[PDB]
Design a protein around this nucleic acid. Structure first.
Ligand SMILES: [Zn+2]
Ligand SMILES: [Zn+2]
Ligand SMILES: [Zn+2]
Lengths: 96, 113, 62, 198, 34, 94, 285, 366
DNA sequence: TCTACCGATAAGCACAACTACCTCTCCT
RNA sequence: AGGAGAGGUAG
DNA sequence: TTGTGCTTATCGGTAGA
């Protein structure tokens, strides 16, 4: 970072990117046969239940292996963009 | 899978059928006591698949399969080829109709066939 | 103090080094000893703590 | 019943395709016969008897192969003895037997004992559902004659044992009706190779 | 190059109708150490 | 989930999954350091080191006898067995 | 190997219909997937109702929603149960002659009425003028596990079928290579009994749908037993493809001639021998 | 004392092979219900109340019914009289190496020595069966060998103790052999050999082969090591180490990975790399090992409000939490929170041993 | 109607569980 | 002079 | 302890004389 303000902006951007990646992983976890009624284009009143249950998604991911593979794949796909920020916040004289 | 204790000696009862009585009866071998049965129910078990206890977490039993993904279809809002397709019924329609869900993390669009 | 779970912030270290009269990033301008010309890029210098291991050269000669 | 009819239709089509590939002068009408035409020519019931036929080689009319379909599964020594007596009476040296279930060990020993006089080939009905030759993984197989085998051995100055080997139990060898001591030509999608049947 | 141990003494009585048993090595700065 | 189980039937096994927001420059949290140590403990094991050596030895014992002949064919040292009639290289020097 | 992974490719005539490949793959998955009877039934109970009929009739209650999701009917599952009872009939080594199953929308069961849209399946045991089946333990321990293990759909051999997408298949198509990325199905079958080949049982199960599965490119994923089905050359080609895939996954670059020489050296005697001492001894013998 | 749940294979036909509860006590294979009714229980309902499953599961009920049927078939009229005691006595006498004591005395000392009453041990057995059933149903988690909650470490008080015991036993054998050889045909100092134990200890300390905790033969290795004098740090870290013995070096399990139980006890960030990766764990700076307390804690527990265990098996517990001291059911408490708070307050006033763990869990209700 | 080898399952019984090097400490 | 038990280095 | 090959040993088995 050039100064402290740039460092704070980078920290906020990293936090928001991690939050977005976690949201993407949570969305990708729904691609199973159990949520076929919810993924269909119809009227479901349980839309808020899938969002408010934030602490259950991690527990469900840690128990299943296919869910874990899907989650890590989605996390890598969403974290490539986060890694791409180094060329924006990095100077040309950076040794790394 | 049901069990009860006769009020006489407080011991387990085994079900039996009598051709002459033509009714369900319970009598234990400890004492010569016979009592009438209730609801004519001798077995009632809820069917569950909890056979491999403490083993489904280590080995992936694949209880909930993942939905297939295709790349031939093309999304409308975005130009992404990867999408999830599955079959489900409608709100009031009959039969199975094909659905599609976009796999783009930034699109979030779903459409029917 | 350099407590592993109570490390001071990077800003504090930079301020401490700046108050000493040196660059806040730990790099100082150096000059080549062979030609005398000034190098274009500053070189980071610092008195780190090193150790000498028991493995020697003559102990491995066979 | 109709499922058995279409199963037998597929078996007959695959058998005719294999015979045409082996060069036994199979008519184009039998090769291009549709399912509806086969059913119409079948009648009410086949009884596993109308499939029995005799075919002769295209190059030589003396050589002929007779296809036998047993009436019931799990054939015994008596059925094999009747079949070989019929072959001796009809003066045929090759025959193809398509059975529903695996043969009796006594029947297998009887077949192996009389293999020197006449050559008998057994095929399961499940193996003839899909044509092995008509596949993208299987390359082109060409059977070399005695003169071509001698020319191949003389060109590279090698013996018959110093060649890549292929077992008789392989599906390709039984499809082409290859005996022990015959070489084949394989073209891969070009470099070619030869396999020795052992 | 000897063993730093201590002897064990316990009385044994025989009946009809302090002896030495063994030496245990002593850890340094133990309950019994100079 | 770190305290054995979350009580949602009692689980017995888990597949760890954690995201660390901090970096090495800022300073790792003790729980983050524990997570990193658990993740990186696999690379410090001595297992699976024998597999490449055993596989290489067993493949060498098979492919040692293969050599090219003066006639252009590929032959094995045992009995001059013909492995390949012609080398399948895509050029450029034979 | 017990998994015996298979590989089935779709035919070329399904592309004419709009979204034909997806519908065909879903139909094949629905037809060739094992669905146990226990996965559909929710509450199984035995009720004392009193060739003559025997007491201790069994009750199986199934919700209509489960049948709607699985696209099944009570008549269909009853017919499947009867067909599978008459197909093997090797178990149930007791005084049993016939087993008739009746379907009723509403049963005279006053024990519980929590579900109103659940259809009841009645199974009645028949005894040949004997009371050898009059006990409850025998039926509860033999017949109940037998019906729950009976699959209402698919075959007992097929374990699971998943739909996958690929761009570089092991068996390329002759023409039409412009199609970048096809859709195929991967089938896993049980290896409990080694008497019959898995491919042999798979060919018999796909008889009604022989036209849908493109048998010109379908091949087992295994290497050892593929030579017994399609010949040594097909096994060699699949082995070369798998070796190239493994090399690509390893990250290194290896020329083609090395892999071809390995394949030709490991299949010189007409069979793929193992890397152990027994394989080398057999190859030399 | 082992209670095993497995399919019955004795006097069982092909139709009946359901899971039953068996007891492996002194290698006798006694049915659980016979042992229940032998320990002062005369009713099936009382035995079921002792096993307070407090759940609705078909498998558990089927297993209990199968065990009852197996007990009924094994011994006829076992409920009436004392036929169960005779059956268990016969089973004990059927062993290859039966105890010298009778049946009336074997159940007091060889079966749950902590509980003096013959009916309290029946309640302890019922509690054990309840725990087993809860674990089988999935409500209770099973113990793991990687966690430090279920593991103990011994440095010198127990490692040298077993060596001293075995050397003393060998010396006693030699002494009695010499006495028998000399009596038929001397000071007491010549009878006892003073070199056997010293030579054995010297061999154990030199070769490093220590006696196996559970086997007479197959001496373990890696117990005694040499110090490093390259620098004081090496000799400081060599003294503070923890070793775990595994059957094979190629595979161990999950012990090679850190555990949340390592927080503040052993160092999870530093471990040797190689064959013993994770097996050798360095202790933390603030790490102490507890020692046995000579004071009696049972007398001080009743003063805080603990109520003694009920002797009669007919009286059930309503909401009284179980109090276990070193695996022994010492009594009951009305409220667990106030009880543990009072215990902690007493401990903080130097009225209790400073090395004592107080565990309160509402899931197990104990 | 009484014998032959013949299919799948239990139970021992084997080999194998990486190279290239360096020290010390204990026997025999 | 020869063997067994530990620790250590490099890929 | 495992992980696979490998050789005894027993359960039934259907077919032919
Ligand atoms: Zn009674
Ligand atoms: Zn889109
Ligand atoms: Zn009903």
């Amino acid at each position: 970072s050039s100064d402290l303000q740039s460092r704070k902006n980078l920290t906020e951007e990293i936090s928001y990117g991690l939050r977005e990646a976690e949201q993407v992983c949570n969305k990708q976890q729904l691609m199973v046969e159990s949520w076929r009624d919810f993924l269909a284009v119809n009227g479901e009143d349980k839309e808020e239940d899938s969002v408010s249950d934030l602490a259950r998604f991690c527990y469900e991911r840690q128990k299943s292996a296919t869910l874990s593979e899907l989650a890590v794949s989605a996390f890598k796909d969403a974290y490539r963009d986060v890694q791409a920020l180094a060329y924006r916040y990095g100077d040309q004289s950076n040794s790394f | 899978s049901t069990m009860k204790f006769c009020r006489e000696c407080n011991n387990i009862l085994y079900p039996k059928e009598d051709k002459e009585q033509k009714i369900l009866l319970y009598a234990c071998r400890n004492c010569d006591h016979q009592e009438v049965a209730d609801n004519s129910c001798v077995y009632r078990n809820e069917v569950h698949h909890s056979v491999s206890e403490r083993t489904q977490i280590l080995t992936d039993v694949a209880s909930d399969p993942t939905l297939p993904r295709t790349k031939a279809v093309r999304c409308s809002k975005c130009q992404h080829r990867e999408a999830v397709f599955f079959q489900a019924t409608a709100r009031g329609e009959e039969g199975m109709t094909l659905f599609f869900v976009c796999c783009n993390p930034n699109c979030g669009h779903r459409w029917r066939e | 103090h350099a407590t592993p779970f109570s490390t001071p912030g990077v800003t504090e270290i930079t301020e401490q080094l700046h108050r000493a009269g040196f660059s806040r990033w730990g790099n100082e301008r150096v000059y080549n000893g062979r030609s005398g010309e000034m190098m274009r890029s500053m070189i980071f210098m610092g008195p780190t703590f090193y150790q000498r291991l028991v493995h020697m050269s003559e102990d491995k000669v066979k | 019943t109709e499922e058995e009819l279409k199963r037998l239709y597929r078996i007959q089509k695959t058998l005719m395709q294999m015979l045409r590939d082996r060069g036994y002068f199979i008519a184009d009408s039998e090769l291009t016969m549709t399912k509806q035409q086969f059913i119409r020519k079948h009648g009410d019931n086949m009884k596993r008897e109308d499939l029995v036929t005799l075919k002769a080689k295209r190059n030589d009319n003396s050589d002929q192969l007779y296809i036998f379909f047993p009436d019931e599964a799990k054939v015994g020594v008596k059925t094999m003895k009747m079949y070989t007596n019929r072959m001796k009476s009809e003066n045929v040296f090759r025959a193809i037997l398509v059975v529903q279930q695996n043969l009796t060990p006594f029947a297998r020993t009887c077949i192996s004992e009389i293999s020197s006089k006449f050559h008998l080939e057994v095929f399961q009905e499940a193996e003839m559902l899909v044509n092995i030759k008509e596949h993208v993984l299987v390359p082109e197989h060409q059977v070399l004659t005695t003169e071509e085998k001698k020319t191949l051995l003389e060109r590279y100055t090698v013996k018959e044992t110093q060649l890549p080997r292929i077992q008789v139990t392989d599906p390709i060898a039984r499809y082409f009706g290859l005996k022990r001591g015959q070489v084949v030509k394989i073209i891969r999608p070009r470099y070619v190779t030869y396999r020795y049947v052992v | 190059n000897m063993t730093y141990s201590a002897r064990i003494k316990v009385n044994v009585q025989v009946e009809v109708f302090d002896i030495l048993i063994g030496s245990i090595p002593v850890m340094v700065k133990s309950i019994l150490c100079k | 989930p770190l305290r054995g189980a979350k009580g949602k039937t009692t689980t017995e096994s888990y597949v760890p999954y954690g995201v660390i927001e901090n970096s090495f420059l800022t300073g790792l949290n003790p729980l983050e350091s524990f997570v990193h140590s658990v993740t990186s403990r696999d690379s410090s094991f001595s297992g699976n080191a024998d597999l490449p050596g055993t596989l290489s030895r067993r493949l060498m014992f098979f492919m040692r006898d293969i050599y090219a002949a003066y006639d252009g064919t590929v032959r094995n040292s045992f009995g001059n067995q013909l492995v390949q009639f012609t080398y399948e290289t895509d050029g450029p020097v034979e | 190997q017990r998994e015996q992974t298979m590989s089935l490719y779709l035919s070329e005539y399904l592309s004419k219909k709009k979204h034909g490949f997806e519908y065909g793959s879903l139909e094949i998955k629905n037809h060739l997937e094992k669905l146990s009877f226990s996965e559909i039934v929710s509450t199984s109970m035995i009720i004392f109702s009193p060739v003559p009929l025997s007491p201790w009739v069994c009750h199986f209650h199934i919700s209509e929603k489960v049948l709607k999701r699985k696209q099944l009917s009570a008549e269909s599952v009853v017919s499947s149960l009867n067909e599978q009872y008459k197909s093997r009939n090797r178990e149930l080594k007791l005084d049993i002659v016939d087993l008739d199953i009746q379907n009723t929308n509403h049963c005279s069961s006053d024990d519980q009425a929590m579900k109103d849209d659940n259809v009841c399946i009645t199974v009645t045991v028949v005894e040949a003028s004997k009371h050898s089946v009059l006990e409850l333990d025998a039926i509860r321990l033999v017949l109940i596990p037998f019906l729950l293990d009976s699959p209402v759909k698919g075959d007992q051999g097929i374990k699971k079928v998943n739909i996958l997408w690929t761009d570089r298949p092991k068996a390329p198509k002759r023409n039409g290579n412009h199609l970048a990325g096809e859709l195929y199905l991967k089938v896993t079958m049980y290896g409990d009994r080694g008497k019959r080949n898995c491919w042999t049982a798979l060919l018999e199960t796909c008889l009604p749908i022989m036209d849908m599965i493109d048998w010109g490119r379908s091949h087992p994923d295994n290497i050892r037993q593929c030579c017994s089905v399609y010949g040594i050359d097909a096994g060699r080609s699949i082995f070369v493809a798998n070796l190239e895939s493994a090399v690509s996954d390893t990250g290194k670059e290896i020329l083609r001639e090395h892999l071809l020489l390995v394949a030709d050296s490991l299949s010189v005697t007409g069979e793929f021998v193992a890397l152990n001492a027994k394989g080398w001894s057999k190859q030399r013998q | 004392f082992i209670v095993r749940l497995s399919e019955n294979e004795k006097a069982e036909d092909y139709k009946r092979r359901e899971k039953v509860l068996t007891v492996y006590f002194l290698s006798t294979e006694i049915p659980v219900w016979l042992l229940f009714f032998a320990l002062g229980v005369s009713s099936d309902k009382e035995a079921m109340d002792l096993i307070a499953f407090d759940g609705d599961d078909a498998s558990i009920t089927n297993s209990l019914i199968a065990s009852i049927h197996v007990a009924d078939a094994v011994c006829e009229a076992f409920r009436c009289g004392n036929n169960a005691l005779t059956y268990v006595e016969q089973q004990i006498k059927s062993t290859k190496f039966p105890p010298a004591e009778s049946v009336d005395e074997c159940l007091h000392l060889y079966l749950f020595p902590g509980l003096q009453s013959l009916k309290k041990k029946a309640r302890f057995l019922g509690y054990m069966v309840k725990c087993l059933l809860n674990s089988y149903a999935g409500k209770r988690k099973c113990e793991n060998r990687d966690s430090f909650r279920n593991k103990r470490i011994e440095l010198a008080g127990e490692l040298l103790e077993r060596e001293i015991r075995v050397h003393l036993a060998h010396a006693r054998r030699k002494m009695t052999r010499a006495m028998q050889k000399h009596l038929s045909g001397k000071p007491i100092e010549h009878y006892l050999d003073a070199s056997v134990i010293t030579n054995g200890l010297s061999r154990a300390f030199s070769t490093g082969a220590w006696s196996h905790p559970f086997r007479k033969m197959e001496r373990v290795s890696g117990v005694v090591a040499n110090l490093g004098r390259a620098n004081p740090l090496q000799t400081l870290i060599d003294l503070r180490r923890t070793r775990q013995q595994v059957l094979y070096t190629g595979k161990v399990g999950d012990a090679r990975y850190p555990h949340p139980s390592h927080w503040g006890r052993v160092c999870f960030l530093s471990t040797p790399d190689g064959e013993n990766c994770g097996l050798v764990k360095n202790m933390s700076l603030l790490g102490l090992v507890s020692t046995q307390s000579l004071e009696s804690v049972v007398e001080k527990l009743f003063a805080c409000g603990m109520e003694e265990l009920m002797d009669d098996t007919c009286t059930p517990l309503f909401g009284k939490h179980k109090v276990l001291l070193n695996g022994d059911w010492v009594g009951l408490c009305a409220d667990s929170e106030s009880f543990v708070a009072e215990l902690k307050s007493r401990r903080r006033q130097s009225e209790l041993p400073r090395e004592m763990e107080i565990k309160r869990d509402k899931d197990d209700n104990e």
